[PDB]
């Protein structure tokens, strides 16, 4: 079960959702970022650095955003058939973690876009368009991992695809 200070990681950012990696850390799903801004979180982007690639956006910060949170490992995808949870939030407030069994990772064009993302199998409840940016995650022995961000779901809502890092 994830515990308070997990979920606080997951943040509402532009059209969707990004999470608390570290302090200093934040990923999200390239196609949420908000276009035409000057500052993210209040930070000028000249003050950040901003690695993105196949709809895995990150961003690292130069002073400490979420002094409140330790660091968490970020794998370059989860491993393939580990469970991992999806911790949507949604606007109402409602927190939904989603079991989902991940599957094999590939690049996709989805829409058009290049997704370096992995697919999975959920495990009714299933994911909307607002979603997207939320953390999967799971516990690796006594700590918790994340491995993508959540990026898209086919038209039954049974697969879905996390965006992850290169």
């Known amino acids: 079960?994830?515990?308070?200070?997990?979920?606080?990681?997951?943040?509402?950012?532009?059209?969707?959702?990004?999470?608390?990696?570290?302090?200093?850390?934040?990923?999200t799903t390239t196609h949420v970022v908000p276009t035409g801004v000057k500052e993210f979180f209040g930070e000028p982007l000249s003050s950040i650095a901003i690695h993105q690639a196949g709809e895995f956006t990150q961003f690292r910060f130069?002073?400490?955003?979420?002094?409140?949170?330790?660091?968490?490992?970020?794998?370059?995808?989860?491993?393939?058939?580990?469970?991992?949870?999806?911790?949507?939030?949604?606007?109402?407030?409602?927190?939904?973690?989603?079991?989902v069994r991940m599957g094999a990772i590939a690049s996709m064009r989805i829409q058009g876009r290049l997704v370096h993302g992995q697919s999975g199998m959920l495990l009714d409840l299933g994911t909307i368009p607002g979603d997207c940016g939320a953390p999967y995650v799971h516990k690796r022995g006594n700590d918790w991992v994340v491995c993508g961000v959540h990026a898209a779901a086919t038209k039954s809502g049974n697969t879905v695809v996390c965006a992850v890092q290169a």
């Open 62 to 99: 130069s002073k400490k955003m979420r002094p409140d949170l330790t660091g968490m490992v970020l794998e370059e995808g989860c491993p393939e058939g580990t469970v991992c949870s999806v911790l949507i939030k949604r606007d109402s407030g409602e927190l939904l973690p989603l079991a």
């Open 1 to 27: 079960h994830a515990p308070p200070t997990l979920w606080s990681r997951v943040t509402k950012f532009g059209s969707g959702w990004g999470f608390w990696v570290s302090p200093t850390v934040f990923i």
